[PDB]
Symmetry: D2
Subunit: 388 residues, 4 copies
């Protein structure tokens, strides 16, 4: 009935989101830069729980070790003044020209070593600030042409980089875990580990796989036309959903980073249903950009909308699942049977069961309707608040 | 100079490819059915190595155990008469109406048990015929709506099914391995395990993962806008490329199954370069459909073209890699450095190396061009046969 | 508050929609055929206004002239018994194998002449039944390969065909208009006139352009990733929206034909807002397929849902536009200024207006925010019924 | 045998192409700015015919009328020194923040008037420099959300703007024509007039349609998954191909602007075949970006490759069409029949021709194969230089 966020809703925002100045491939900035301190206070007033950062959002690139300490101390004061937390941090290995062919998988070996040292420096800072999750988006790991990158050698280099970071945090005794954020393309013509599946598969080849999970992003998987709730379910099934980036996207095109709820609204409904029913307990992090049409009042309006739309969808998904009429429809569509083992009786009892093959009435089974359209219209009526 | 296939090129075709009668969602068949025996002889004359089948391509559905033995015996005679092999087989768990909500992940438990028994029956037949690989394409495992399928429960059911098949073949002592073929959509609105990455990740959760790999298909990954040579490289890196389906696709749309070489021609070039340089030794299997515009002469013309275009691209990719001018360009673009470990000296020596951070000249590194456009035009000149 | 359709809502359905038996490229029919008479009565009971047909839906192909009259007479009795109307009809020039390379643009001239005679026969029948609109979907006009179709010659043939149909209806004195339905692909690899824009442009080259408009389909334009409300606005602007096909689609993939409201829900909201605010008065026609998972109860449930979701969205869009808070936000975002002429003062007064260039303060204009995010969240709150 | 361009090949480049500094949505510039004078001389040495510009590429924004004359005079000297021409020019109505909601269709009326005056100023300069074509790419005309733009009012404003520009050039007596360049998205979430078809349709509603054509761009239509040679054929058929932008694109994703020949190579082959067979006589203009991985030697290498790949494809397409074996295959596939009128005998003779319907043997027609696969493999062999 009310949709006001509280810090217990665990909503978080990156400094780079509300701080995006509006520069796009075809145009100049439309907004002035925001001081991180002002973003923290403004987000706290809207009901956020916390903020996240790349190293270069907080400390401008090339900063003297003394300008560094000043930047951190001011940030830390705003956090103390507001109650805001920093649950995640990440490294910028994509903006500076030295990263034009990648960080961890750049063809030049000296660049790969620099990327790792820049990363390690920021992990120390993240731990100091209490982050629990360290995200890695390899936005420049990839290629525009086929001969430029041997992908097996590049995966060797990627594995080597994450293995060294794992060695570092265990040797330091830090309680932080890594989350890889996949994206299929942009800014490289194809990016390595392009989807949640490719990232999950890669993690299983690392020396200490339990330290690594995924940070899927709504618009990223939709840039490949994939079903984001399905990919999150696979991640939850694997025990690897360590963090999540929420935003909106209208289909297969450039990464729009719209506010959450915009883009594919029904996919947002099913995503919230899944996160809340699985008991996901991490941050609900928004990685979005207020459109460059907006001034600063529109920036805060867009950020508030992220939170509002999550809380409306949560309410509607909870109402859906609690409705006795929906629970009966789920049984009518045999969702209860899907959850039962196919063959708990075992292989030999399955091979000897004539009711499973020799005497199975296929025509009778085929004729049973699944009743999925009635179930889906109940879900639509619940989403639109049109139940009677 | 010549592009004539021989059975040592290991080219294989499914019975359902040249046997496709032309029925599409909007139109009736344009060709009569082909007898499997005639396809085997015709393909042998074109230079193919072997054929593959679904159970229902070879033995019509509902066949009496005696009509079954007759169908197999005639097939076996054509194989003996021609020298053709059967390296792969698979199950049809998608055409009959009983599979309308899936085989292994159908919501109805009796259908899941039937799907497993239909599968086990055909694995026995495949082994008899000497297949080494058993493919599974879960074309109906998926959903058109969000509430119809709990994807975590469905992955539990999928895992249970593959685990039971693994138990079966090990208990029988068979030397056959499984290959999962991913597809993102069609005929379901979203299919589970939609890409090579999602399939690789799933395999790592099976009880005996060494028995399972992937069977990627060119057009399937391109239906998600992904780079097929990159996904095959990840599969090779994981040691899981057990089989491959070759065809062409023009972008993100329905699955066209064009002949190999059609669709994205440069991606075909880089795919052949990779398979030949990695020493892939399995079958080069074509899963394609001669367009329904064609009569039977056009069917055989289309099948021959599959093989011809593979052999032309092999020649051009070999010429590319053998060209001393290309080898120098690869060094100019530092492909040799990509293959060297980033930090064989180890974590502590990396942390103490001032040349990796405190004293790294980032501006000098950033200014080095990668020379990728010159390398890519050499690759284009080689593909087009325009070297001078 | 209630969402019950009445025939005054003008909802119509094709016989082929609820009558779809479930055959897809990978599977057999899951439902038995429906008699047209039974569909008319069932749709009338749900509150529909009318039905539409292809010639071959009503009269099976190759029917004797006497079996033809029997089929029509029974249909006509069901229409009289129910009050149902037939506002649109169309020709099937895509299912029979003779149309495998097209109807009006088939390379074989004898097929093009046959396609026109099959068409003319059905226009006479449509007029008899009182249809006002005759739709043409050239589903087989197109190509899978570049050399198979010279597109300039094919457009000449397409123009010739529509010009002859225009000559026919004017020479007969019939009051019927034509609507071309674009689709980008499927079942041909690329279809001619692939989008609403290409069809609008083509019409302007016909000899009697006032007889022709478009019949856009939601999922068709979304198969090219386009904004369907924007394309309908262009069609309305041109005075050419003669009919519309409503359904749902999840992105760029095969044509799903989901029920209306499914697929991209926010695009459905903006489409209904536009049709109702522009005063579109034609039929609201559903061209959809109940998924093949469903039995006949699910078919009728899916058809009812089409109508229900239109009436819910109509209510929400009307509430949006009537809200004084939204009307103020529209002014804040200068929608009122967009509707004023840029230069009613004329070219010379614009060239002499220093306030338009020499003395325009660009920095002050640039700094004004558009306030679009606040407006869009008001639209979201209205769609979800979350206004407070 | 040789692939060296000459200025008689009419190859042209925009100043912004080779001058692109490498700034993308995620990263800083990797190359220093180029002086226009140096680009003209470098392009002349590679064999180009001419260059094109936006006003702001040549004269930096806000320039004093005296700094303006200096910039133009230096440019004019480089043109005189090199023999280079300027066949096209265009306006930048997308980079400055004042254009964040559009130029001609911005909601603010004062911005629309400014956009027209900025445009008119540059048309005068273009004429002085001898351009024959004035391009308009409305990159900011569009929306990220549904309520922000009434598209009928925006098309009214767009029509008003182009009508005033037409009035201007006719009142001045200038011999210049306009070309509208469509793009479906990026940088706006959806752009108005998103495809060649929508632009062609819009032109027909202008007061003086003969002054306006299209400037299609390879990658733009492919961002909607459309067939670019088909859209160019429709433009040629309408008599509206006034200019063309050549580049490469790998599928539906952000606009990559790769060099021509990269991206979809077979579509490039069929495009060149069509332009050369239709006798297109305008500039072959490259609108591309050397990837930001490259230094200045890679920039010139990429530009040279544009020209080289056009000349290789021209040679291969000419060889295809001249091959007697291909000419026979075209007849076998009835391309000659496609070019004959369907019914030159007229409507009444068609209605009385029993051979067109009552006595047409549909089964015999249906059984004829189109032989398109053999024709397409001849085209593939010609493209790859594999004829024997
Ligand atoms: O770098 C981590 C990330 O989540 O922050 C923004 C960037 O686009 C990416 O998605
Ligand atoms: O069933 C296995 C498979 O490879 O055969 C054809 C089907 O489309 C699939 O791709
Ligand atoms: O034939 C006219 C039409 O509207 O009916 C169904 C077909 O798919 C098309 O969309
Ligand atoms: O502005 C005209 C244009 O052709 O120049 C570059 C821009 O992207 C557009 O395609
Ligand atoms: Mg993103
Ligand atoms: Mg992110
Ligand atoms: Mg396929
Ligand atoms: Mg396959
Ligand atoms: Mg459709
Ligand atoms: Mg339709
Ligand atoms: Mg472009
Ligand atoms: Mg352009």
């Amino acid at each position: 009935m009310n949709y006001q966020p509280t810090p217990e809703d665990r909503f978080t925002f990156g400094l780079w989101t509300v701080g995006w100045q509006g520069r796009d491939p075809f145009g100049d900035a439309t907004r002035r830069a925001l001081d991180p301190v002002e973003s923290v206070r403004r987000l706290a007033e809207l009901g956020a729980h916390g903020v996240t950062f790349h190293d270069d959002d907080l400390i401008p690139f090339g900063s003297s070790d003394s300008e560094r300490e000043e930047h951190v101390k001011r940030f830390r004061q705003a956090l103390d003044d507001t109650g805001m937390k920093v649950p995640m941090a990440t490294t910028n290995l994509f903006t500076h020209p030295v990263f034009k062919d990648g960080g961890f998988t750049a063809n030049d070996r000296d660049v790969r070593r620099y990327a790792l040292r820049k990363t390690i420096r920021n992990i120390d800072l993240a731990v100091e600030l209490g982050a629990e999750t360290y995200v890695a988006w390899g936005g420049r790991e990839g290629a525009e042409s086929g001969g430029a990158k041997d992908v097996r050698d590049a995966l060797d280099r990627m594995k080597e980089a994450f293995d060294l970071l794992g060695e570092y945090v265990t040797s330091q005794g830090y309680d932080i875990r890594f989350a890889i954020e996949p994206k299929p393309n942009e800014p490289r013509g194809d990016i390595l580990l392009p989807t949640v599946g490719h990232a999950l598969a890669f993690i299983e080849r690392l020396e200490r796989p339990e330290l690594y999970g995924v940070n899927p992003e709504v618009g990223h998987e939709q840039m490949a036309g994939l079903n984001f709730p399905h990919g999150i379910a696979q991640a939850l099934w694997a025990g690897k959903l360590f963090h999540i980036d929420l935003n909106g996207q209208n289909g297969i095109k450039y990464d729009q980073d719209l506010r959450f709820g915009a883009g594919d609204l029904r996919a947002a409904f099913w995503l919230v249903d899944l996160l809340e029913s699985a008991g996901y307990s991490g941050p609900r992090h928004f990685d979005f950009k207020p459109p460059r049409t907006e001034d600063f009042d529109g920036v805060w309006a867009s950020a508030a909308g992220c939170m509002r739309n999550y809380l409306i969808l949560k309410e509607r998904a909870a109402a859906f699942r609690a409705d006795p009429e929906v629970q009966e429809a789920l049984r009518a569509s045999r969702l209860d049977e899907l959850a039962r083992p196919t063959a708990a009786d075992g292989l030999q009892a399955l091979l000897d069961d004539r009711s499973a093959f020799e005497e199975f009435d296929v025509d009778a089974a085929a004729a049973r309707g699944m009743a999925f359209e009635r179930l889906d219209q109940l879900a639509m009526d619940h989403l639109l608040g049109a139940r009677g």
